[PDB]
């Protein structure tokens, strides 16, 4: 379990490495010493950059970190005290309101 929390390092490291490379190899390329050409290129390149930042980092890495942090609770934290099973409480209720 103590080693398991190396998930925090592994994911934090990976994110930083993706961010550095995704920045350097995408948006930096949108910059150029030519004024107007630089601006017009940066327009299209930035849109691609924002696309990759969302597609790769905001969604996927957030998604993986979401699960991995949750797993830490499930596996290492809860298993020290949160044990056993119970039944879900299902009282009489007027549930079908939105339908």
């Amino acid at each position: 379990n103590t080693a398991s929390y190396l998930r925090l390092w592994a994911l934090s490291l990976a994110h930083a490495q993706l961010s550095e490379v995704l920045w350097t190899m995408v948006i930096h390329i949108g910059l150029h010493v030519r004024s107007l050409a630089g601006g017009l290129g940066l327009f299209f390149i930035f849109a691609a950059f924002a696309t990759l930042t969302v597609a790769i980092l905001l969604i996927m890495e957030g998604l993986s970190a979401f699960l991995h942090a949750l797993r830490l609770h499930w596996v290492e934290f809860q298993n020290k005290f949160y044990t056993g099973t119970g039944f879900k409480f299902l009282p009489f209720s007027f549930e079908h309101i939105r339908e």
């Binding site: 994911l11 934090s12 994110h15 942090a69 949750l70 119970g86």
Partner: peptide
């Protein structure tokens, strides 16, 4: 049983923020 949720509210976002500290 001790409900973990009152502490999860902060504990989980924190550990996530460590993974996604951006």
């Amino acid at each position: 049983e001790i409900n973990p949720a009152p502490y999860t509210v902060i504990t989980f976002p924190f550990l996530f923020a460590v993974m996604f500290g951006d």
